[PDB]
């Protein structure tokens, strides 16, 4: 990147430092739904056509991405929780054979065995914040967690999360390649970075940064209960923005 580009990107960074209002919510973007399949378009890498999980797997295979383990309950991004790639492939059952390392690729994984088409959903940690300098609500992506929609035979769909990816680590490598956002207009005009920045992803809230560290699953037995709770949280997040501004009030015309 040229220094001009670096300065531009530094200007295009959301600073949630002195925000008077923050709200951290976790989504469960299902890739098997339109408007979220952009992250699944190529289930298996096709030449220069790759989905997010394939790109991420290649990046970790080249020591170019710092991803952290999915710890049930919390998301500490520290050097302690950096994942071990060989352990990840072994513990999740990925057959790999080590090729010539050449300091480029740690382990040679066949594309047929890359679990790129089973990751059918993503945990997206997004942080709604109120900008202290111009009073504007904005969403800042914190991390994305690829969850492999695996099958446990007896346990059917397992949906075990793989790891946690800080968004600033993956942002440089997803801000370049172009993807098509719709199946009606197939123009590769925008990037996945634009998909995440414009919040074009559609997902149900599965957890909020609660004071008891409680997830929706704990106090919602059935999927419909989780659906209605997610709708409630969305309504309250929207109600915050609605109550901020008072140009829609007509109580004065009385």
């Amino acid at each position: 990147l040229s220094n001009r580009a670096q300065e531009f990107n530094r200007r295009l960074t959301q600073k949630t430092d002195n925000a008077p209002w923050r709200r951290v919510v976790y989504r469960r973007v299902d890739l098997m739904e339109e408007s979220n399949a952009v992250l699944y378009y190529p289930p298996r890498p096709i030449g220069d056509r790759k989905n997010l999980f394939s790109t991420i797997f290649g990046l970790i295979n080249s020591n170019s991405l710092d991803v952290y383990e999915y710890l049930d309950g919390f998301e500490a991004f520290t050097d302690q929780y950096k994942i071990k790639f060989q352990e990840f492939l072994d513990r999740f059952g990925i057959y790999y054979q080590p090729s010539t390392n050449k300091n480029a690729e740690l382990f040679k994984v066949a594309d047929s065995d890359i679990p790129s088409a089973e990751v059918k959903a993503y945990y997206v940690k997004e942080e709604w914040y109120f900008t202290p300098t111009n009073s504007d609500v904005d969403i800042k992506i914190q991390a994305i967690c690829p969850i492999m929609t695996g099958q446990d035979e007896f346990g059917e769909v397992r949906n075990q999360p793989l790891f946690w990816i800080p968004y600033e680590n993956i942002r440089p490598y997803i801000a370049r390649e172009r993807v098509m956002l719709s199946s009606l207009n197939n123009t590769r005009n925008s990037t996945i970075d634009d998909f995440f920045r414009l919040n074009l992803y559609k997902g149900d809230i599965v957890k909020t940064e609660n004071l008891h560290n409680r997830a929706l699953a704990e106090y919602c037995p059935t999927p419909d209960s989780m659906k209605m709770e997610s709708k409630r949280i969305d309504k309250e997040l929207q109600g915050f923005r609605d109550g901020l501004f008072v140009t829609q009030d007509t109580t004065w015309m009385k």
């Binding site: 580009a5 300065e7 531009f8 408007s35 956002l181 009606l184 925008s190």
Partner: protein
């Protein structure tokens, strides 16, 4: 006693050919989305301060004034140049008292006529024209119509991290700033070599002095008359290449083929030319003619009201009598269903409530905003702007600037004031013009 120390009152020279758009708020973008076009809906409310937007697009005569100014001074330089001429009466290098002064051109000394000019003078005059070997068409040489202008980045000189004093780069008292930490910044320069080739560079170097926020550019400014041919293969557009910028009938028509760099050069020349013609009361800080931002363009196009899809009050594209409200492509292969095939004379349709003409039609209009698919959400809502002074070695995809508005071929959609269109800063199309703008020196009441 705290009475106050006011300053001497200045004057506001309302620019010629421009109108005043009031400060206001508008919701950028189209709320309802056409699913057949694939695009989703991206809308963000904004607010913009009052500014002066040009009534019409820049016409061929108005840009020909620019190219003629560049021609005249280059010719004066050649006359003063000892190589071609050497008169030295066109280059004032010393003051009437005799002390050396900064060398400037003597614009009072007239350029000799083609007949009265001697061999040296005629050589200097002809050393900027191009005579076609076969057709004997004596025309201004396109690669010699170059404009050398300087832009000081007031914005970048004001960032906290771009402070000359290292101690002032961080107001946090807990953060100890390394005494010798290097802040690498880029500056765009351009210098004419001994051969005569324009050498543009982007100098990256540690922040040293104020000479690092000065961007110097030497841009060839002659319009790309071959856009008419290049943009439309298998078409009889050979005549507009030879007519549009040259024919006297095509003077009030909007100028085409002007790239983003050439538009910026034109606006800067307009700024300095205005300054040369207006006396400044002591301390006067006058703004500069600039290319409108995307947000300012969209605000002034829709007349401030967020209910307007078009620069006209209704949603229909046609009056109740059957007359179209803009110069676009109404039907399939029907560019001239509105009465005009190629761009039309400026001020040929009805203006806005603001008074802007051809605000969506004729030619698309260059904006000063760098293009980004997520651009509307990455820029602030106070006078929104996404500025990116691209580096000479940047990828060509990073040199896209927003071209907002519709042209004589944009279908109803691309003429909508909320539909973003882009084009590369390097190229100039036959359907893209521009409209220089300047911030209004306004102290008005509220609503």
């Amino acid at each position: 006693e705290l009475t106050g120390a006011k300053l001497s009152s200045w004057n506001e020279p309302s620019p010629f050919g421009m109108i005043q758009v009031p400060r206001g708020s508008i919701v950028l973008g189209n709320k309802e989305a056409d699913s057949l076009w694939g695009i989703p809906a991206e809308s963000r409310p904004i607010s913009v301060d009052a500014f002066w937007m040009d009534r019409t697009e820049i016409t061929n005569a108005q840009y020909r004034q620019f190219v003629y100014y560049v021609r005249d001074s280059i010719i004066r330089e050649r006359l003063a140049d000892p190589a071609y001429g050497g008169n030295e009466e066109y280059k004032i290098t010393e003051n009437k008292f005799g002390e050396p002064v900064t060398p400037h051109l003597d614009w009072s000394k007239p350029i000799p006529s083609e007949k009265r000019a001697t061999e040296e003078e005629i050589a200097a005059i002809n050393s900027v024209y191009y005579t076609n070997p076969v057709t004997h068409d004596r025309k201004l040489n396109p690669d010699q119509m170059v404009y050398r202008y300087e832009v000081y980045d007031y914005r970048s000189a004001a960032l906290r991290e771009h402070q000359l004093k290292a101690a002032k780069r961080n107001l946090n008292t807990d953060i100890k700033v390394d005494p010798n930490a290097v802040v690498m910044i880029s500056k765009d320069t351009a210098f004419v070599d001994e051969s005569g080739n324009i050498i543009s560079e982007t100098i990256t170097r540690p922040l040293s002095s104020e000479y690092d926020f000065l961007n110097t550019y030497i841009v060839p400014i002659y319009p790309d008359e071959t856009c008419w041919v290049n943009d439309f293969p298998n078409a009889r557009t050979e005549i507009y290449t030879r007519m549009y910028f040259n024919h006297p009938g095509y003077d009030d028509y909007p100028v085409v083929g002007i790239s983003w760099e050439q538009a910026q050069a034109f606006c800067a020349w307009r700024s300095e030319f205005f300054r040369k013609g207006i006396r400044l009361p002591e301390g006067q800080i006058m703004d500069d003619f600039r290319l409108p931002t995307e947000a300012e363009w969209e605000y002034a196009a829709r007349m401030g009201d967020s209910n307007n899809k078009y620069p006209w009050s209704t949603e229909d594209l046609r009056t109740g009598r059957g007359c179209f409200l803009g110069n676009f492509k109404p039907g399939e292969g029907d560019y001239t269903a509105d009465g005009h095939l190629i761009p039309s004379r400026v001020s040929s349709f009805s203006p806005n409530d603001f008074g802007l003409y051809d605000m969506a039609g004729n030619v698309a209009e260059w904006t000063s905003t760098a293009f980004s698919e997520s651009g509307l959400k990455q820029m602030s809502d106070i006078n929104p702007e996404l500025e990116y002074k691209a580096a000479l070695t940047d990828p060509y995809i990073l040199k896209q600037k927003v071209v907002r508005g519709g042209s004589w071929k944009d279908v109803a959609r691309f003429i909508r004031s909320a539909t973003r269109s882009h084009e590369y800063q390097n190229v100039g199309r036959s359907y893209i013009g521009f409209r220089c703008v300047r911030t209004s020196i306004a102290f008005s009441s509220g609503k």
